Design a protein around this ligand. Structure first.
Ligand code: FAD
Length: 463
């Protein structure tokens, strides 16, 4: 038994953003975050990226990474002294953010306004937030298998997982990566580079005809496969796993089409499933279409319960009911999540943005609704020295691209791809086009039926 006014569940990108949001509005509010992880809230994007590109080993320790412009940066959101302890909190009377790492909420009670930690202790809340994110999908073929194979397989998302992998890559001869996602691909390049240094084999395999095939059009997905390949990666499309066994001391991957890949370690990056274990005890709605907790436009589930981030199935007027997995989204909705908690009764209006880096040399931004199967227009040109994340970082000063681009709304190598529906732009992927995301947002938000989409591209430096 004990009490805190602002309590937030899951200690991630969304929880920390709300934590900052509430503080801003109610200065002197007492905030407590509970987190499964033993780590203090940190951003995630460096884990599949810039953290792999440092030649300093004690950076596997400190997690102080280098950007493409080469300036240090801590992974954790703020230094730890910024927090206040969890016991000292009620007596701080001036408020702060306290962090209960190593604990887990296992019972919610909406009428009773209290959670239950795994160790059985209880905490009463006045205002609660569920920002639990998600657990990466396993691959049912790996589930039927023994604990021996299960062990030789990681599911990349945490820091525990970043260190574990990077460790293995200095140990074995061949790491296979399952998943044609951005993560998958980022990973595969991250490994691909290290490979150019140890000789290790990096295989990437996935059911799609190409990298990010479910998103990008064939011709750009295909181009992307080449870059993955060039970074030293034996890449295997149209791959569908049948079984994973152990023979010759190694891991054997059998494919539905007969092929057989033999390897040392599997890292699987094939989706996220949203953490909704709390919904059963408390009794909130989940979405069977999109997954995760059903909230309204004010990201609200029931009185004194808001949800945000990757677990957030929210309504969005200029689009409809949704659930997205952006970092940008987690920052914003979290913020909004804390804004609403302190009686701000406000809608969600942001257009969340995604981004991916494959190395310092190639970057994709995306926003809106992007699917390969929708009608597509893409305009393309030869890229200039600026058209890559290295420059975009040297300029803006940051590596987290949703920062460089703000959340406002104003021989080929770069271009923009419009995703249409009825001569009207509904999604956008930008390839190596930087600091033009507000123009991306504007176009989508307006919704005009351009009888020529070239002109629209003249807006991204494309001539
Ligand atoms: C390697 C990697 C890279 C990415 N790169 C990019 C990128 O480059 N660009 C981009 O736009 N997006 C990227 N994303 C996606 C983006 O980072 C996520 O959508 C966002 O960070 C989600 O944050 P969240 O806090 O909502 O979820 P999380 O960050 O998962 O926070 C959830 C936390 O809640 C805890 N938790 C869950 N259930 C309970 C419980 N019952 N009790 C207590 N604690 C609980 C978990 O332990 C976890 O620590 C990336 C994701 C990963 C994994």
């Amino acid at each position: 038994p004990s009490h805190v006014p602002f309590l937030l569940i899951g200690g991630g990108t969304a929880a920390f953003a709300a934590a900052r949001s509430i503080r801003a509005r109610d200065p002197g509010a007492r905030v407590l975050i509970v987190s499964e992880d033993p780590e203090l809230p940190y951003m995630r994007p460096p884990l599949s990226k810039e953290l792999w590109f440092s030649d300093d080993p004690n950076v596997t320790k400190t997690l102080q990474f280098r950007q493409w412009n080469g300036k240090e940066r801590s992974i954790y959101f703020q230094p730890p002294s910024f927090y206040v302890s969890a016991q000292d909190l009620p007596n701080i009377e001036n408020g702060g953010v306290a962090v209960l790492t190593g604990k887990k909420v296992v019972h919610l009670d909406v009428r009773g306004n209290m959670v239950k930690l795994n160790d059985g202790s209880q905490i009463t809340f006045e205002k609660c937030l569920i920002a639990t994110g998600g657990t990466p999908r396993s691959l049912s073929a790996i589930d039927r298998a023994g604990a021996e194979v299960k062990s030789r397989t990681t599911l990349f998302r945490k820091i525990g997982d970043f260190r574990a992998l990077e460790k293995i890559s200095r140990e074995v001869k061949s790491i296979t990566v399952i998943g044609g996602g951005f993560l998958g691909s980022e990973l595969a390049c991250a490994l691909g580079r290290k490979s150019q240094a140890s000789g290790i084999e990096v295989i990437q395999l996935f059911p799609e005809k190409g990298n990010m095939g479910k998103i990008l059009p064939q011709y750009l997905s295909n181009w992307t496969m080449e870059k993955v390949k060039r970074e030293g990666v034996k890449v295997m499309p149209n791959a569908i796993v049948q079984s994973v066994g152990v023979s010759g001391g190694r891991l054997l991957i059998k494919l539905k089409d007969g092929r057989k890949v033999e390897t040392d370690h599997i890292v699987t990056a094939v989706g996220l499933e949203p953490n909704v274990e709390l919904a059963k005890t408390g009794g909130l709605e989940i979405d069977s279409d999109f997954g995760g907790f059903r909230v309204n436009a004010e990201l609200q589930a029931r009185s004194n319960i808001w949800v945000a981030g990757d677990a957030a199935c929210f309504y969005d007027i200029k689009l409809g009911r949704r659930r997205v997995e952006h970092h940008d989204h987690a920052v914003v909705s979290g913020r909004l999540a804390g804004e609403n908690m302190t009686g701000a009764a406000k809608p969600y209006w942001h257009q969340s943005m995604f981004w991916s880096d494959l190395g310092p040399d190639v970057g994709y931004e995306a926003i809106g609704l992007v699917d390969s199967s929708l009608p597509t227009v893409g305009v393309f040109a030869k890229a200039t020295a600026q058209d890559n994340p290295k420059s975009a970082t040297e300029q803006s000063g940051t590596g987290i691209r949703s920062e460089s681009e703000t959340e406002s709304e104003a021989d080929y190598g770069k271009g923009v791809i419009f995703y249409l529906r009825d001569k009207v732009v509904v999604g956008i992927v930008l390839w190596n086009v930087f600091n033009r995301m507000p123009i991306a947002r504007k176009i989508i938000k307006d919704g005009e039926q351009h009888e020529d989409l070239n002109e629209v591209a003249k807006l991204f430096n494309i001539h």
